[PDB]
């Protein structure tokens, strides 16, 4: 009937790994000394939890450790505009009352949740579906009215909006289906028989050379003379390709008093 | 001249390939380290071999060391070992913190008896000892705030209040207010 | 999915909801906190969440996963990488199925057709 | 209320607009006899929770304990 | 509609002795004639908006 | 021009507008339109600013 131990205990084999994140000699030496006497030291604290005993987190010197919150530009000013840039400093400075308040959720992520409908409203749905697969839809009016009567109105509005969302997500997934199953001009008339017997590895760096000159030793024996000769050959081909060039299009964002189009930005300023 | 290797191009005809080599070869800028060379660069000498980030052996060995206690076990043993721990809610799990934080008081009982003659010398000692406490307690005034202790995350965190739904929503969810600024109906 | 190195900051902000988070560019200043030597190309630092990933690999190669990787410069890179791909996965899904939530979308505030005005 | 999804302009409960206010109990015996503050320790779990232990007594006898 | 009308910036005089840079600079400024262009909204002064480049020193509370 | 083209989000309260469920019960079945995604807001001549 021994206490249960978590998987992390079998990795370290001890409950007292003195893990301090502060990388100063004073701190790590004391930790190494404390890590050795943890078995006969009354001033020992666990950092590996168990079923019978909780544990502390990672230590930062005498205080505790937590990573710097993921950079977030949202902030609220107090006295003057601080123009907070979370990318300008490595560690986030503490918020002073008269300077700044940071956004909520120092350690938070974006998820999707759902309210749980009331138990009595759920039971009316179970009775309707059950009476549906047994007696058919045409003989479930009373069970349907019990849903409209017992389920609070906010629940019915959730049920109404769910059907409208999944109708939206259905079309979005089918539009993606269309663009995916569209046959491009470079695959017209091609089937699975025209596919080559290659796998993912056959397209990697060992088999398919990247589009860089120093990925391997291909161009390592090239002399300057061979380069000057190649410049002459590429210029000869340009006597046939440079003959054409796209014509300049009109500027759609000429008027500054008009909502401009978010056209693709130029590669270079 | 062009050197051949295991990594090949992606062109069907040999003319497209030769055009690609002449294309890449026309952009090469040689930088030599030897004087008396038409292409000589004391500084800004470009390397001719590309670096590739790859997981080393020390990388792959430590990840395989994290799974060592599992390779000796079957899936049924893993579940019965680390997943299906027999429930036993009789332990004083929070004794770990009572011992740690209760030590400040026990340490104070010993430290308040320092034989330092000068009263103002012990003022410095208690000020130093208080600095150790305030790293956790934070606010020295009473009825103002709470201390800050970072604790380990285990399956038994909030084990006796998992049944309460409002405690989960208060701890986990930071709801986003809308233009119709009201609590959800 | 983002098919570029840059994205307009406003295109991932909410129009009818309070903005409590941004989707910032990769924090390049964290790359100079690594004390050891490493080779990094500038052509890989702007794409989302990848710089934090490469830094994590560099730290897992120089150090390991035990008692040497547990230093602030290396744990923040692992946390940023784990957090960047979680937010970007959520913003990407919200961009796919809830495009009307963001600024710049024409469905955030639909403009009526001329036949709806009665002229 | 902020965490629950309601942004808050201003502060306090002295509602400037069209809302009812609830001033603190006047510290005089007249109001101290009619009113008393809500003691949170008096909000309890319904004792019907203890009737679930009936399952335990029945399972023990079913298993021969 | 009330919020939108409220953002159309009003007219704020340039003359300012409260900001010491203008107290010095406006002594060397040349008042040139503003020829009427046929409108009633000629911004011949600065605008009463916190984000105006000539009014950012003014505190709008 | 920028403040003419500076709008606020969410517009006005939809619940204070005519409902579609009410028009159906009144004898007028509303028609559903699509968003006009092709129009670009622009400021008028300076005389109107």
């Amino acid at each position: 009937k021994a206490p249960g131990q978590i998987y992390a205990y079998d990795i370290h084999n001890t409950h007292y790994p003195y893990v301090n994140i502060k990388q100063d000699s004073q701190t790590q030496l004391l930790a190494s000394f404390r890590r050795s006497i943890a078995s006969i030291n009354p001033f020992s604290y666990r950092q590996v939890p168990s079923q019978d005993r909780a544990a502390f987190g990672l230590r930062w010197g005498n205080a505790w450790y937590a990573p710097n919150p993921y950079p977030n530009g949202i902030h609220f000013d107090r006295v003057f505009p601080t123009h907070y840039d979370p990318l300008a400093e490595t560690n986030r400075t503490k918020a002073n009352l008269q300077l700044i308040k940071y956004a909520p959720g120092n350690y938070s992520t974006l998820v999707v949740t759902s309210e749980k409908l009331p138990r009595p409203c759920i039971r009316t749905i179970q009775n309707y579906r059950r009476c549906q697969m047994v007696n058919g839809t045409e003989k479930c009016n009373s069970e349907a009215q019990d849903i409209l009567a017992i389920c609070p109105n906010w629940a019915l509005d959730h049920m109404k909006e769910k059907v409208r969302f999944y109708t939206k997500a259905l079309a979005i997934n089918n539009q993606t289906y269309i663009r995916a199953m569209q046959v491009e001009e470079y695959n017209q008339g091609r089937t699975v028989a025209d596919v080559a017997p290659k796998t993912w590895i056959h397209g990697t760096r060992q088999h398919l050379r990247p589009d860089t000159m120093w990925a391997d030793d291909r161009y390592t024996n090239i002399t300057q003379t061979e380069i000057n000769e190649a410049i002459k050959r590429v210029e000869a081909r340009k006597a046939r390709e440079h003959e054409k060039k796209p014509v300049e299009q009109a500027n759609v964002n000429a008027n500054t008093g008009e909502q401009p189009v978010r056209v693709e930005k130029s590669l270079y300023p | 001249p062009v050197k051949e290797g295991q990594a090949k191009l992606w062109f069907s005809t040999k003319e497209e390939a030769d055009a690609y080599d002449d294309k890449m070869i026309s952009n090469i800028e040689l930088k030599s380290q030897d004087y008396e060379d038409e292409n000589f660069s004391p500084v800004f000498n470009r390397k001719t071999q590309e670096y590739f980030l790859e997981p080393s052996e020390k990388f792959k060995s430590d990840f395989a060391e994290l799974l060592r206690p599992l390779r000796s076990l079957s899936f049924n043993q893993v579940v019965d070992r680390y997943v299906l721990i027999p429930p036993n809610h009789t332990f004083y799990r929070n004794w770990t913190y009572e011992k740690f934080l209760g030590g400040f008081g026990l340490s104070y009982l010993i430290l308040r008896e320092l034989p330092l003659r000068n009263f103002y010398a012990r003022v410095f000692v208690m000020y130093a000892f208080a600095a150790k406490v305030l790293d956790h307690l934070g606010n020295p005034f009473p009825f103002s705030g709470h201390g800050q202790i970072v604790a380990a995350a285990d399956r038994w965190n909030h084990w006796d209040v998992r049944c309460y739904d409002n405690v989960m929503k208060a701890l986990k969810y930071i709801r986003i207010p809308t233009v119709q600024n009201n609590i959800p109906e | 999915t983002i098919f570029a190195e840059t994205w307009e900051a406003s295109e991932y902000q909410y129009r009818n909801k309070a903005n409590l988070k941004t989707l910032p560019v990769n924090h390049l200043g964290k790359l100079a906190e690594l004390k050891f030597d490493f080779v990094e190309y500038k052509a890989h630092q702007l794409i989302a969440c990848h710089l934090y990933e490469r830094m994590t690999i560099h730290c897992m190669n120089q150090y390991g996963l035990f008692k040497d990787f547990y230093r602030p410069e290396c744990l923040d890179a692992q946390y940023y990488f784990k957090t960047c791909v979680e937010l970007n996965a959520a913003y990407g899904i919200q961009k796919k199925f809830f495009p009307e939530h963001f600024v710049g979308s024409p469905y955030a505030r639909p403009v009526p057709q001329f036949q709806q005005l009665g002229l | 209320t902020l965490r629950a999804g309601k942004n808050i302009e201003g502060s306090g409960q002295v509602h400037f607009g069209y809302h009812d206010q609830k001033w603190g109990m006047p510290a005089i015996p007249m109001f101290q006899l009619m009113y008393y503050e809500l003691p949170g320790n008096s909000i309890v779990v319904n004792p019907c929770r203890n009737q679930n232990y009936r399952l335990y007594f029945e399972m023990r006898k079913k298993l021969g304990i | 509609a009330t919020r939108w009308y409220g953002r159309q910036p009003g007219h704020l005089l340039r003359a300012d002795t409260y900001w010491i840079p203008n107290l010095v600079s406006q002594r060397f400024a040349k008042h040139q004639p503003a020829h009427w262009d046929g409108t009633q909204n000629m911004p011949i002064f600065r605008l009463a908006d916190p984000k105006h480049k000539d009014s950012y020193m003014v505190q709008f509370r | 021009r920028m403040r003419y083209l500076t709008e606020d989000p969410a517009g006005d309260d939809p619940l204070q507008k005519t409902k579609d469920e009410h028009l159906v019960d009144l004898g007028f079945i509303p028609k559903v339109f699509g968003a006009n995604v092709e129009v670009r807001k622009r400021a008028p001549h300076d005389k109107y600013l």
């Binding site: - | 809308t178 | - | 302009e9 | - | 021009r1």
Partner: peptide, 23 residues
């Protein structure tokens, strides 16, 4: 929802000057 929130349809450039925020 932030009270001082505005949706602008034309580009603006904000000055990065200490103690001041403006276009």
């Amino acid at each position: 929802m932030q009270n001082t929130t505005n949706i602008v349809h034309v580009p603006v450039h904000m000055g990065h000057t200490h103690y001041f925020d403006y276009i």
